[PDB]
Design a protein around this ligand. Structure first.
Ligand SMILES: CCCCCCCCCCCCCCCCCC(=O)OC[C@H](COP(=O)(O)OCCN)OC(=O)CCCCCCCCCCCCCCCCC
Ligand SMILES: CCCCCCCCCCCCCCCCCC(=O)OC[C@H](COP(=O)(O)OCCN)OC(=O)CCCCCCCCCCCCCCCCC
Ligand SMILES: CC(C)OC(=O)[C@H](C)N[P@](=O)(OC[C@H]1O[C@@H](n2ccc(=O)[nH]c2=O)[C@](C)(F)[C@@H]1O)Oc1ccccc1
Ligand SMILES: CCCCc1oc2ccccc2c1C(=O)c1cc(I)c(OCCN(CC)CC)c(I)c1
Ligand SMILES: CC(C)CCC[C@@H](C)[C@H]1CC[C@H]2[C@@H]3CC=C4C[C@@H](O)CC[C@]4(C)[C@H]3CC[C@]12C
Ligand SMILES: CC(C)CCC[C@@H](C)[C@H]1CC[C@H]2[C@@H]3CC=C4C[C@@H](O)CC[C@]4(C)[C@H]3CC[C@]12C
Ligand SMILES: CC(C)CCC[C@@H](C)[C@H]1CC[C@H]2[C@@H]3CC=C4C[C@@H](O)CC[C@]4(C)[C@H]3CC[C@]12C
Ligand SMILES: CC(C)CCC[C@@H](C)[C@H]1CC[C@H]2[C@@H]3CC=C4C[C@@H](O)CC[C@]4(C)[C@H]3CC[C@]12C
Ligand SMILES: [Ca+2]
Length: 1282
């Protein structure tokens, strides 16, 4: 009993009264310890107050309590538990820190263990323990993804180390010497005159001796810096900063490949991998939950509540019948509610209330607020009257039994209280009158799929327990890391720079806000840089602290994806399935009612023969492609060029051929909605000729309308139209969530308008607190130097995104929900003081919850609901294939593999010396030696550092030559072992051969530059990825899935093309300028640059800033040619940049899930039972027993064949000459000769003996079944007939 020996009971009588009362006092002690840790405020440079001293005093009490508890629990038994060892080490480290603090007086750094005490609160309650274990157990399948991410990070770090090796160290120094790097405020790297980078064409010169872009933290100077930069880029946070810095230090044409490929491979592909693996795991758990019958409990309770709703009023209807005026009164009112007019009346009143609420804005007219107040009072009175009419008619038990009627009742009861409270001047309105807009969802009742939304809410209310437990786990994780961050960076974020940091760890609320901002992944690298500079800096011991921001980013973004996706998936796997269970009851029941009550020289010779043929079908597809290419190659920045002349003239013939084709189209038919489209587009193209001098506004909507050229090829490309149709179907399916999310967004926007109506204004200098004061000039000091003053004008400006009215609030909340620039908006809204005034530092921190709750509800919950709904909808679309035969989706594939299998060829040659080298090469020790040598070579490669010694470089070159020569030696022997005619018949052998000859030419060039071939040396490391079976199979299956669905990605390609063109035609002129989001690096001036900008926006880097930088009121380039001051730049940027972000993202969700879809077979596999992986090794073990594919085996070979098969496929460690061989020989094998039994026959016999066995005499049943529902067999199983 985990005790064995028992010491005398005289002092071990402790397990008697330690069950009920000793299990809770310790939990309260832990809670008090957490509160005390939260109260502690870290001061910079040993400062303190009274509260810190009191807390340090009570820490002694907590330590003695925990030590007494540990001693009592240890005298009970001599710690082996996982969660008790943690308590023991916590208490021992606490004692050590306490004695060190008492004796020596880093001591303080040692007490960072205190943050582990809240974690012990998990162990107290098993309800959180089980959910924590469920969260943890999902980490095992993602270890392969983690290893892949590590390998790609290492490879890209080495490649970037080779490419960008200390190049980011030259900048422009305006002063005659190196004093204060006089290059604006944030200097950028530059290149010398002989270089291809950026040269400052000013009075300044490019001179080396520069620390680096981000204080020397972001650069590929050595392996650690390069790896950190690659990770920070792969997290898709500030990768464009690194890209632009490299584009300034080196040329702009080469290094985009590195970052674009890194983003595509290490971010999008990895996210797809994670989503697929997690979806498979959740589907497996959902299928496992059927045995427990969780869905049965929800189903019975669903059909029971509707019984009570229709029965309580039924007996209430009996009360209304006279066997008093009261019953007559109740009868009239009861039928008044169920009149189909009262419902529309209350809907109209709700819409009127929404109209009244949504009409509030900054400095609204007085009559508007008077009508707002009187209409609000009238509508509140009418809604109270509606409440009274409904409650009296149905009754209290018949009213509160409805879930919705519990919502509007609370809404009215709280709204009247808030109304009176605001009326009596207690506080500004909170906004609780806005949630009356939820009742506007009652319109869905008339439409179909109202019950589908009700099923989701019912499932959520059923699973509220698990939802609360998961949210508690997330909150505890956030609290623990906030305490750790407060301990590590408490008061260390105070540098000399004029702008004090807002995202610090000074207080507990500030630490919570910073940790939440890091978890959302927005500007987390800035916090990491501040934390690095908080310590010594870019040195060896001052950089390790960066790992704190890595685990928090890795262990946090993971937890969310197992908290808000699972909740989204399971509660959507119930409701949909729930809606699948009732939707037959509403069909059979009526069927019960129905079953009772009812009882011209235009022919295919010279004008149409070569029209409908595929040749003409795909000949015009090439011409549509060429027309699109010509459209994409225009020059927007200049209106009159010879380049625009040829393409502006090449379309004249292009439209001439297309117009000719339309003549061939009017004769064939007298017309669906496709052959008009092109015609209509063609009908627009002729206007291009009829312009003359009227190019004022007609062409401004004529040239932009040319982007419809690519999208008319969907009709002529079968498969693309199918994908578009599937996309439209998915849109119509997801509308049910889209409308609800939009309504919730509108509600939050109204609340935000009520909160920050005009409060976000600020003046240029913080001294002036009103617009009247904010006038004239003021004096600002450059870089916080009292001796460097500059006059600057005083400006009274609003926020970039404000809450002045409902539309501005919706824009701001959208930019917040995209996680772009939300910390700045949060910290600007924190300072909002009064309706028309300026900001006060940290006036209301508590308003931050508004920006947090929203992010929890819209950003994290609604989006995950969206993704899970897409996943479940696609799964049910792929699952409804009504093929319910005997073989249940597994034996079908097993029999297919058994039929489509063949032994592998031997290729074991004679000429024993060649056979001797073949035996040497194939040995596993040789493969281990190669893996060791590859690791050594990549270690040598990952050792070069900036500022290295010349002898170091010579030694590295010598080692490179030695390793390369050894690899050529290995390649030659291999070649002689496998012969040139068979050595190259392997995907990996050709890969190795190209690298070796690619690593030789540059070796020759070393003694004679170009660095393209050097990178080949790194690529050999990818061979190490082909060693683990699971990761290799996962990668290969995902790659095949991507190969099988090209048109889904073609949709994203087409969307990128169209938008780009649109951006080139509209925003393609705006002048390039620094200190602006439109510069040499980010612009619409060329098609590749527009594509790069759109990729940047799809990644979501600073798109909310490019939108503002594309606003009207900009000058544009002198290349394009009175009134041209700044009349150049449109207001389309609101619809252009928002819609794109909502479209592209959706398309990506379409590409991910689909790729996941057709790959469920691997994702939900249950490797324990038989599967294609198990049957794969049969060929590998019979390859050496069959000279070729053939199909002829040895009768005696079965002796070792039966032994070599694994227990999952064959038999365990039992004796071979036993019932296994008896059953193998006793069954009905084909009636061939002694050893002329063919491979697939034996394979089918083995797979039949493994599972799915039947009585003798049913072989012909399998024979007819393998041709009825199983795919074609081509009469190839003649030798397998018996
Ligand atoms: C999810 C999946 C989504 C897929 C999205 C794919 C995104 C691809 C992004 C491509 C962006 C290309 C930007 C680029 O290359 O930069 C522009 C550059 C112009 O360089 P420029 O500034 O003129 O040179 C001055 C020298 N100091 O351009 C160049 O010089 C490069 C030439 C154009 C790029 C050609 C690539 C296509 C291959 C054609 C063959
Ligand atoms: C998560 C939930 C997702 C839904 C969120 C919806 C967000 C809507 C954005 C808020 C509308 C803002 C309207 C506005 O202020 O005017 C936009 C513009 C007029 O320009 P204006 O903003 O006055 O100029 C700058 C002012 N200082 O006028 C316009 O350009 C009008 C159109 C702007 C709004 C377009 C909404 C995009 C929807 C795309 C649908 C995608 C599929 C098609
Ligand atoms: C890659 C994105 C920006 O390009 C898109 O356009 C997609 C269309 N938008 P999306 O919102 O991507 C953001 C989510 O990435 C999660 N993330 C990432 C790495 C990780 O290790 N763990 C993890 O949870 C996350 C941090 F939670 C975010 O919520 O799409 C999704 C929406 C819901 C669920 C999954 C993806
Ligand atoms: C089908 C054509 C329009 C697509 C679309 O319409 C919506 C209306 C309301 C809410 C969402 C959408 C929507 C999206 O497809 C969509 C939008 C966003 I924002 C979104 O989240 C991505 C931004 N952010 C996550 C919070 C990433 C950091 C996702 I996933 C899907
Ligand atoms: C059912 C709901 C969504 C309907 C709400 C629509 C009406 C009431 C809203 C939508 C957009 C709003 C406008 C948005 C912007 C401005 C500009 C501002 O200088 C005066 C107010 C004004 C003109 C708002 C008045 C109210 C408005 C017209
Ligand atoms: C996230 C939690 C669970 C674990 C992460 C470990 C972090 C917090 C720990 C592990 C190793 C630690 C570092 C180890 C060594 C040094 C050098 C010293 O001169 C200052 C502290 C510093 C820089 C530590 C900072 C905190 C640190 C980075
Ligand atoms: C599959 C689709 C997206 C491929 C589209 C390829 C076409 C549109 C691209 C590929 C290469 C591109 C060219 C590459 C380089 C330049 C030089 C630059 O000074 C003007 C644009 C110009 C001339 C580009 C025009 C557009 C272009 C021709
Ligand atoms: C990724 C695997 C396979 C190879 C890389 C692991 C080892 C060899 C790497 C990891 C960290 C690396 C070190 C990181 C930092 C420096 C400081 C620099 O001034 C000289 C090189 C030196 C000392 C690197 C040498 C190589 C190194 C020790
Ligand atoms: Ca960002």
């Amino acid at each position: 009993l985990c005790l064995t020996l028992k010491n005398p009971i005289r002092r071990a009588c402790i397990s008697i009264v330690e069950w009920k009362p000793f299990e809770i006092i310790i939990l309260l002690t832990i809670f008090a310890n957490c509160v005390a840790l939260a109260i502690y405020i870290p001061f910079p440079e040993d400062d303190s107050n009274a509260t810190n001293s009191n807390l340090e005093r009570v820490e002694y009490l907590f330590l003695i309590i925990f030590t007494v508890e540990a001693f009592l629990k240890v005298i009970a038994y001599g710690l082996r538990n996982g969660w008790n060892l943690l308590d023991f080490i916590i208490v021992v480290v606490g004692l050590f820190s306490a004695i060190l603090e008492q004796a020596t007086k880093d001591v303080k750094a040692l007490r960072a263990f205190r943050v582990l005490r809240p974690l012990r609160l998990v162990s107290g309650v098993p309800s959180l323990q089980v959910v924590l274990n469920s969260i943890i157990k999902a980490m095992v399948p993602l270890l392969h993804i983690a290893l892949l991410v590590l390998f790609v990070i290492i490879i890209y770090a080495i490649i970037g180390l080779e490419l960008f090796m200390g190049k980011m160290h030259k900048t422009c120094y305006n002063q005659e010497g190196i004093a204060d790097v006089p290059a604006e405020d944030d200097p950028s790297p530059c290149a010398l005159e002989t270089g291809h980078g950026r040269q400052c064409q000013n009075g300044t010169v490019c001179k080396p001796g520069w620390d680096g872009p981000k204080h020397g933290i972001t650069n590929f100077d050595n392996f650690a810096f390069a790896m950190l930069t690659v990770f920070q880029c792969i997290t898709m946070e500030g990768w464009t900063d690194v890209l632009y810095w490299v584009n300034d230090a080196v040329g702009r044409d080469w290094p985009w490949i590195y970052f674009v490929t890194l983003i595509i491979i290490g971010s999008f592909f990895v996210l797809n991998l994670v989503l697929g693996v997690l979806s498979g795991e959740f589907s497996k758990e959902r299928e496992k939950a059927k045995a427990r019958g969780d869905f049965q409990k929800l189903r019975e309770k669903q059909q029971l509540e509707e019984d009570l709703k229709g029965y309580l009023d039924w007996i209430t209807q009996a009360e209304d019948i006279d066997p008093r005026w009261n019953r007559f009164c109740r009868r009239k009112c009861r039928a008044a509610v169920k009149s189909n007019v009262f419902y529309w009346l209350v809907i109209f009143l709700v819409f009127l209330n929404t109209l009244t609420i949504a009409s509030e804005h900054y400095n609204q007219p007085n009559w508007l607020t008077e009508v707002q107040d009187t209409a609000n009072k009238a509508l509140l009175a009418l809604f109270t009257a509606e409440m009274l009419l409904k409650m009296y008619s149905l009754g209290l038990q018949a009213y509160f039994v409805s879930l919705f009627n519990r919502f509007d009742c609370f809404v009215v009861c709280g709204g009247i209280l808030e109304t009176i409270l605001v009326e009596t001047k207690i506080m500004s309105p909170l906004g609780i009158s806005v949630l009356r807009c939820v009742r506007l969802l009652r319109i869905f009742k008339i439409t179909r799929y109202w019950n589908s939304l009700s099923n989701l809410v019912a499932s959520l209310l059923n699973s509220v327990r698990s939802i609360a437990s998961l949210l508690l786990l997330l909150f505890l994780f956030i609290i623990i890391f906030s305490l750790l961050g407060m301990q590590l960076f408490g008061g260390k974020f105070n540098f000399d720079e004029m702008q004090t940091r807002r995202s610090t760890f000074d207080n507990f609320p500030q630490s919570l806000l910073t940790v939440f901002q890091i978890l959302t992944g927005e500007d987390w690298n800035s916090v990491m840089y501040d934390g690095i500079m908080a310590y010594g800096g870019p040195s060896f011991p001052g950089m390790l602290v960066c790992i704190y921001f890595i685990i928090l980013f890795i262990c946090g973004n993971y937890i969310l994806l197992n908290v808000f996706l699972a909740i989204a998936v399971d509660n959507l796997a119930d409701a949909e399935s729930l809606t699948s269970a009732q939707k037959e009851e509403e069909e059979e029941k009526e069927r019960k009612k129905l079953a009772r009550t009812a009882s011209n020289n235009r022919f295919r010779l010279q004008c149409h023969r070569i029209v409908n043929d595929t040749i003409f079908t795909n000949l015009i597809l090439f011409f549509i492609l060429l027309s699109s290419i010509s459209l994409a190659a225009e020059d927007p920045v200049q209106h009159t060029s010879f380049r625009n002349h040829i393409l502006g003239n090449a379309d004249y013939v292009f439209t001439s051929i297309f117009t000719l084709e339309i003549i061939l189209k009017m004769t064939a038919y007298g017309r669906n909605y496709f052959n008009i489209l092109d015609l209509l587009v063609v009908s627009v193209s002729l206007i291009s000729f009829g312009i003359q001098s009227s190019a004022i506004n007609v062409v401004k909507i004529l040239r932009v309308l040319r982007v419809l050229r690519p999208l008319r090829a969907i009709n002529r490309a079968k498969g693309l139209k199918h994908v578009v149709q599937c996309v439209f179907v998915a849109i119509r399916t997801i509308g049910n969530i889209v409308i609800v999310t939009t309504l919730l967004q509108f509600m939050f926007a109204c609340i935000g308008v009520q909160l920050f109506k005009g409060k976000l204004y600020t003046c240029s200098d913080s001294s002036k607190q009103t617009e009247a004061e904010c006038k004239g000039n003021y004096i600002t000091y450059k870089d916080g130097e009292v001796d460097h003053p500059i006059i600057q004008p005083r400006s009274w400006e609003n926020s970039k995104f404000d809450f002045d009215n409902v539309l501005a609030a919706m824009m701001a909340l959208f930019t917040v929900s995209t996680f772009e620039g939300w910390p700045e908006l949060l910290y600007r809204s924190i300072d909002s003081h009064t309706e028309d005034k300026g900001p006060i530092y940290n006036y209301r921190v508590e308003i931050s919850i508004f920006f947090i709750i929203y992010i929890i509800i819209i950003a994290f919950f609604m989006m995950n609901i969206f993704v899970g709904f897409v996943i479940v909808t696609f799964q049910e679309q792929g699952e409804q294939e009504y093929k319910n035969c005997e073989l249940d989706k597994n034996q079908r594939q097993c029999v297919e593999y058994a039929l489509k299998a063949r032994p592998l060829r031997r290729y074991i040659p004679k000429n024993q010396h060649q056979y001797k080298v073949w035996y040497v090469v194939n040995s596993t020790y040789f493969e281990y030696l190669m893996f060791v040598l590859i690791l050594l070579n990549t270690i040598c490669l990952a050792m070069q550092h900036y500022g290295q010694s010349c002898l170091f470089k010579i030694a590295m070159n010598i080692l490179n030559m030695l390793f390369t020569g050894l690899f050529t030696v290995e390649m030659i022997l291999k070649l002689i072992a496998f012969k040139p005619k068979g050595y190259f018949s392997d995907p990996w052998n050709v890969f190795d051969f190209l690298i070796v000859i690619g690593s030789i030419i540059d070796v020759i060039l070393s003694e004679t530059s170009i660095t393209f071939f050097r990178l080949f040396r790194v690529m050999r490391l990818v061979k190490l990825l082909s060693r683990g079976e699971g990761i290799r199979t996962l990668l290969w299956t995902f790659i095949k899935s991507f190969q099988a669905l090209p048109y889904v990605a073609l949709l994203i390609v087409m969307l990128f093309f169209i938008y780009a063109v649109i951006g080139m035609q509209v925003f393609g002129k705006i002048a390039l300028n620094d200190t602006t989001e439109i510069n040499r690096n980010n612009n619409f001036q060329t098609f590749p640059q527009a594509v790069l900008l759109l990729f940047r926006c799809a990644t979501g880097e600073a798109w909310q800033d490019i939108m503002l930088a594309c606003m009207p009121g900009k000058k544009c380039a002198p290349e394009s040619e009175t009134e041209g001051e700044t009349p150049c730049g449109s207001s389309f940027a609101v619809f252009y940049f928002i819609s794109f972000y909502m479209l592209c993202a959706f398309l990506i969700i379409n590409l991910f899930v689909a790729v996941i879809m057709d790959n469920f077979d691997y994702l939900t596999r249950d490797w324990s039972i038989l599967g294609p992986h198990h049957l794969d090794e049969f060929k590998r073990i019979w390859a050496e027993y069959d000279p070729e594919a053939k199909g002829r085996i040895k009768h005696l070979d079965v002796v070792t064949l039966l032994r070599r098969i694994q227990p999952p496929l064959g038999f365990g460690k039992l004796c071979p000459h036993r019932v296994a061989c008896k059953r193998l020989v006793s069954m009905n094998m084909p009636l061939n000769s002694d050893g002329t039994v063919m491979f697939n026959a034996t394979l089918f016999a083995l797979v039949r003996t493994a599972l799915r066995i039947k009585t003798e005499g049913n072989l012909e049943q399998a024979n007819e079944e393998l041709r009825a529902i199983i795919k074609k067999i081509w009469k190839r199983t003649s030798m397998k007939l018996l």
